[PDB]
Design a protein around this ligand. Structure first.
Ligand SMILES: [Mn+2]
Ligand SMILES: [Mn+2]
Ligand SMILES: [Mn+2]
Ligand SMILES: [Mn+2]
Lengths: 194, 194, 194, 194
């Protein structure tokens, strides 16, 4: 069955960018809930598809996307954050420069579209293997990033920031770059590019 | 495995309301395609679920809804049409009166929302089991009617009428009532109330 | 220009169901922001429609719905809450009983669909003037309730509850009934029914 | 006020790729209807905005997008078709090579996503001004291409092909390249790069 992954750091390790209380809730409550609900849904969807219970299989779809996406998104997110993440790899910086001009332009552009999400969602830097270029995108709710390989995600559900930042989502999006785990992001870029 | 159901009548049996050229293409090409694609998609979905490949399983959802819905919707539609439909059962008629005032009012209201569908989709009379009332709704593309039991569907994809009616969708929607299979609709209503 | 309405009570008056800090942020920051953005958008949409700038008018639509809906929804919401709201009017209780069986069934049913909103949104009790019945519905993000007259709304964006309830949205939805302004709700029902 | 533009050719001028019966219905009935409904909807929207009736203005958005998009899309489409299109300009061809490898690759990729549209909609070649690259996309129903400049559109509403091609959408999508107006597409590209 799907399981809640341990964080690769302690709950207070991202302070003062993301508080201990947020990390604890986000991991132990929000991500846990997705995982718990997903396992129930997965089991039902396996049942319905095996039996060709079509109307049921279709009805279960929103819940599998939401909870399964929730598990996917948060699992990537935890690996994408670090107290000391490093800097992009030489290859990744080179590609950032090619596709966005500079790391600064990428940060502004991804920060901007992420800030602009209406309601709950995620911003993503990804790598598109067909056109062989970095792209940025947003996703609603827990919809997983599709059509490109995820490299770095920014969660902008209110629960990702509210206890600390309250309504000031832009400050959280801007500050998250301070704890971007460029080691992990650079590894994901290398793997997407093999 | 899913199969294309035989029509319960011959291809020319609904003339002059729906042409035999339409019925043939609609069943032998359009429905058949949904069935053929459904079987493939269901196989791929069962594999993704068996492998625990969550992203892959989520990515197949639109195709399962579209082709699976296509199969559901058209399967119902063929049973909902007849040269000699009869009239609503007494219990269905009394319920049509309780919930819409008259059959006339129901036909007008459902015809109007069906005609108003933007793009491809369907109009439905359904029965809501929680509130024990008849309701009308539309669905986009091949999305199946959910949240109530389907009783009578009107397909307003352009392939359902264009060869005969061209752009004049309203003439098709108004005419289809003449071949509504009230025997089947009444049986579906009875089943929905069990 | 659209303006932020004053609350009909002081910021701490809904304690212990909704905290002073939440009321203050929700009103002075979140609702204010919708209003400020709406006025900018409204002015641009007036410009584009007057000039027949069609592609621009269409592009502005999501922002008008989001901010304009935000203004609509929160304006109703503040009037819907009270330290001592009273009980439903005789007419409204009678209708609740007819359409839902009891006030308890209505509360459970609306609470349930509201709890189930994926991401950000609202739950609503409304009155449908065509079929002359109470209904319940949900809306995504700030989409306004359409097709029926709003009577009572429950905001389930995370900002509506998080500082106090954290992840436990169900407790907030259940507790909000304690501060439902049945005087206001009963007035809205009478007005919808004239 | 919006008006139905004259076609830049006679109704039979695209045979055998698109029939004169199609061209006539498509322009005189389908496009004309979008134009007629657009003018009415725009008038209603201007009234709602003038009156400050926010709910009413928001409620008219789907109709403005659908009819307004309908007008935009078909207006472009007529200019995008010709018996004697010519060939891409040298700058457009060099850019097609830079962004897709070859014209062959572009035609295949756009044809495939266009064929894959579920229900009614459109395939587009566009130019993205931020990243100064060509891109391909699809749009649902009459949603206009947004976020990039439209260069070449393929209508895959069933009314665009059904009378000639019936269910065989792929034959229509593959054939339309033979009447793509590269003079117009090249002019649109040049304008997009200004
Ligand atoms: Mn989260
Ligand atoms: Mn059909
Ligand atoms: Mn709110
Ligand atoms: Mn068209």
């Amino acid at each position: 069955k799907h399981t809640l992954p341990d964080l690769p750091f302690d709950y207070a390790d991202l302070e003062p960018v993301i508080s201990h209380e947020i990390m604890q809730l986000h991991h132990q409550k929000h991500h846990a809930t997705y995982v718990n609900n997903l396992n129930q849904i997965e089991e039902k969807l396996h049942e319905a598809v095996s039996k060709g219970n079509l109307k049921e299989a279709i009805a279960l779809q929103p819940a599998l996307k939401f909870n399964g996406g929730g598990h996917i998104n948060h699992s990537i997110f935890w690996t994408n954050l670090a107290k000391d993440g490093g800097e992009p790899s030489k290859e990744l910086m080179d590609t950032i420069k090619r596709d966005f001009g500079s790391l600064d332009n990428l940060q502004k552009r991804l920060s901007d579209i992420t800030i602009a999400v209406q309601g709950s969602g995620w911003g993503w830097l990804g790598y598109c293997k067909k056109d062989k270029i970095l792209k940025i995108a947003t996703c609603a709710n827990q919809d997983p990033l599709e059509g490109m390989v995820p490299l770095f995600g920014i969660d902008v559900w209110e629960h990702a920031y509210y206890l600390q930042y309250k309504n000031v989502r832009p400050d959280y999006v801007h500050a998250i770059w301070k704890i971007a785990n460029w080691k992990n992001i650079s590894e994901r870029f290398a793997n997407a590019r093999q």
